[PDB]
RNA sequence: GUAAAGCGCACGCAGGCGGUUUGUUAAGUCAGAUGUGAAAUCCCCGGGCUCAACCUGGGAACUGCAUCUGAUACUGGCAAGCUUGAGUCUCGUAGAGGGGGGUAGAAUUCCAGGUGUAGCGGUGAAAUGCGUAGAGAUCUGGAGGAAUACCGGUGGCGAAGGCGGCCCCCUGGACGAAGACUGACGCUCAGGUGCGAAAGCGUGGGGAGCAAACAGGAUUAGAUACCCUGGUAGUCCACGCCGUAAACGAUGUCGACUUGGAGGUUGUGCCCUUGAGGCGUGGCUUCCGGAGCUAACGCGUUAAGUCGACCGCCUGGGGAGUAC
């Protein structure tokens, strides 16, 4: 059973770029749309709207760029069942900076690169090369 | 949308899930090739072939099933444009080195007929020799003379001459071919969405690549 | 399983009112009722153990929908109990 | 999956994990500060013994614990919900799902009698055996036990083990759909509890066919076998026990994603349904195969692909699943 929301989403996106998908659509939810921006703002996806009144759906246009796609690599890390929290000083670095670390914030969801100068730490949440 | 449409689209419902972005339709169990993107796919390839034919490119025309072979001769012999017609043999670009040695013998072969050196010599030596060259002529006869390989490769159909466009995109020779449904454009890398059969559509599109050609080189 | 009739009997005594079958109140007193109406049917025979399997489904289930209860609202909990004489 | 390794299968306590919205809290989490974390080691920068080892000044570190002040995204607690998870109801559908009790036809064997006469039976041949006390064959009547040809399938149902004639009684689950209702009531599960093929065990029945043991005949160098002639337990039933199997998909359960092809079974919607029908669309199920995965064979939307939650298990062969 759903368990895990988070990783379900980043999933949809990795087999997506996998089968060329257009897109990838999915039930929306406040994290999973604060995760999105993060990618967007990161140019990762094209863009993202989350549909529906009572019931959103969240619509992630996936992206690619010459005869691959954009996201390349993208796997959870603070899963359920074992989450991960560092501190500023201890912000995980991926692809040596050239990849991106979704990390949640008390300010807010962030890329590592962003929160680790704010000078605030939080719980990591994903690896987005 | 001329004479294009008189061709449509091919293949029952084998086809091929990759096609399946130049579909349009598919009445009656088969699949209609989408000309909203077949003739526009057209000229942007086409302009291609004229564009390093000017230089006299070296142009390989393949097609060997017979029904379209006849035809694919022709057009490709409408200028210094080469062609393929019978069995594509393997190796005859990968491994020219050493499929040329055969292109000799056709050679040194017909100046016997050709010429006065060949009346000497019983029958069966002579016959011999006829009969090897028949053979020379199937295969190597459209290609016997292309020192080299070509600037570029064009095959009427992907799945039946696939064995060609293998030692094609091995050797960066850009390839261009016509595929539908059941084919796959995972090799060509110039799609052309068109029924792969028909006499009529074979034709069709062989002319016009001929000529873009010959009026290619200025 | 249970008559139509005795369904709909039982869905008023407990039920929030009518034409409702989801109340919690409602499907424990449903279960209770084949699970007691089924003990006669099990007193006989006994070696019926397919049949077993899916009576003990219903009182683990019945057992959770009252845990349940308990946990949403201690009252129509303690209530509920009463009328059909559980939880020893 | 086949190398060591998925418990034979379920139910489920503890425990681990938890769809979605708002508010609230601030416990985990994060930020800052204050204590404390002996000195010496270590490291950095720099000194002193001719250098070095060695010695020494300052700093970094001591990744920890406590308290104080905040931050509130995420996890947690509380409140109010929400409906897509799960469940209930209604009405339908298919089925060798289970327990009990009847019952039918075919056949085998046995008993009795008629007809009938010298073989039958068996094998590669044989022989044991059965026959003139009349077999076998054939016909008639009777007794009894076990299993249900055809349908039958790539089929169906079940947690697994497993479940086939027909009828009734009692009873479990699954699926579809117009919907109606509940409102996260869920997933997994050590220990625990229950279900467990065949063989085997106890008590009491039953006993036709088949058949461990056993006894003959044969083959063979021998033949404590394979084959033939017989035949006890058992196989059948009731109740209790045993709990194992190559208990095998050799593949734990739950959920979400990822090209396609051909077919089966069952529910349901639309279509002159005027039709066999055609088109959709759920459940379960065969074979083929793409990406990908794999040591390879292969698996491949019913994954061994891509992921998340929980559990079980492996750590070279023999000794040994043996000893205690
Ligand atoms: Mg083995
Ligand atoms: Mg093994
Ligand atoms: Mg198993
Ligand atoms: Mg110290
Ligand atoms: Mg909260
Ligand atoms: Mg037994
Ligand atoms: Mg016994
Ligand atoms: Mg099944
Ligand atoms: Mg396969």
Same mark, same amino acid.
């Given at each position: 059973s759903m368990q895990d929301p988070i990783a379900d989403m980043l999933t949809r996106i990795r087999n997506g770029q996998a089968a060329n998908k257009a897109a990838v659509t999915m039930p929306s939810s406040k994290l999973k749309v604060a995760i999105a921006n993060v990618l967007k703002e990161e140019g990762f996806i094209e863009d993202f709207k989350v549909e529906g009144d009572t019931k959103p759906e969240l619509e992630l246009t996936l992206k690619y760029f010459?005869?691959?796609?954009?996201?390349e690599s993208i796997q959870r890390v603070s899963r359920p069942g074992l989450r991960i929290y560092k501190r500023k000083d201890e912000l995980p670095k991926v692809m040596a900076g050239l990849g991106i670390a979704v990390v949640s914030t008390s300010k807010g969801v962030m890329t590592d690169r962003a929160a680790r100068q704010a000078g605030l730490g939080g719980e990591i949440i994903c690896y987005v090369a | 949308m001329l004479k294009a449409g008189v061709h449509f689209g091919h293949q029952? %419902?084998?086809?091929?899930?990759?096609?399946k972005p130049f579909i349009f339709g598919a009445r009656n169990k088969v699949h209609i090739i989408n000309l909203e993107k077949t003739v526009p796919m057209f000229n942007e390839a086409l302009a291609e072939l004229n564009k390093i034919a000017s230089r006299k490119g070296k142009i390989l025309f393949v097609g060997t099933? %017979? #029904?379209?072979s006849e035809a694919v001769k022709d057009a490709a012999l409408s200028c210094d444009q080469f062609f393929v017609?019978? %069995?594509?043999?393997?190796?005859?670009?990968?491994n020219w080195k050493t499929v040329r040695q055969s292109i000799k013998r056709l050679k040194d072969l017909e100046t016997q007929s050709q010429d006065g050196?060949? $009346?000497?010599?019983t029958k069966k030596e002579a016959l011999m020799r006829t009969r090897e060259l028949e053979k020379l002529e199937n295969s190597l006869?459209?290609?016997?003379?292309?020192?080299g390989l070509p600037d570029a490769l064009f095959v009427?159909? #992907?799945?039946?001459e696939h064995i060609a466009i293998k030692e094609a995109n091995n050797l960066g020779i850009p390839v261009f071919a016509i595929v539908d449904?059941?084919? $796959?454009? $995972?090799?060509?890398?110039f799609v052309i969405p068109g029924n792969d059969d028909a006499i009529r559509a074979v034709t069709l599109y062989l002319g016009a690549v001929a000529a873009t050609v010959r009026e290619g080189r200025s | 399983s249970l008559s139509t009739e005795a369904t709909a009997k039982i869905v008023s005594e407990?039920?929030?009112?009518?034409?409702?079958?989801?109340?919690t109140e409602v499907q424990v007193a449903l279960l209770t009722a084949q699970i007691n109406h089924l003990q006669g049917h099990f007193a006989?025979? &006994? &070696?019926?153990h397919h049949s077993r399997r899916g009576l003990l489904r219903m009182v683990s289930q019945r057992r959770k929908l009252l845990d349940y209860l308990k946990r949403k609202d201690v009252a129509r909990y303690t209530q509920l109990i009463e009328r059909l004489g559980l939880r020893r």
């Open positions: 010459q005869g691959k796609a954009v996201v | 029952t %419902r084998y086809w091929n899930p990759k096609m099933k %017979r #029904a379209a017609n019978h %069995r594509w043999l393997g190796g005859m670009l990968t050196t060949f $009346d000497k010599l006869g459209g290609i016997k003379d292309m020192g009427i159909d #992907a799945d039946h449904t059941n084919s $796959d454009p $995972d090799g060509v890398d | 407990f039920g929030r009112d009518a034409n409702d079958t989801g109340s006989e025979h &006994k &070696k019926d």
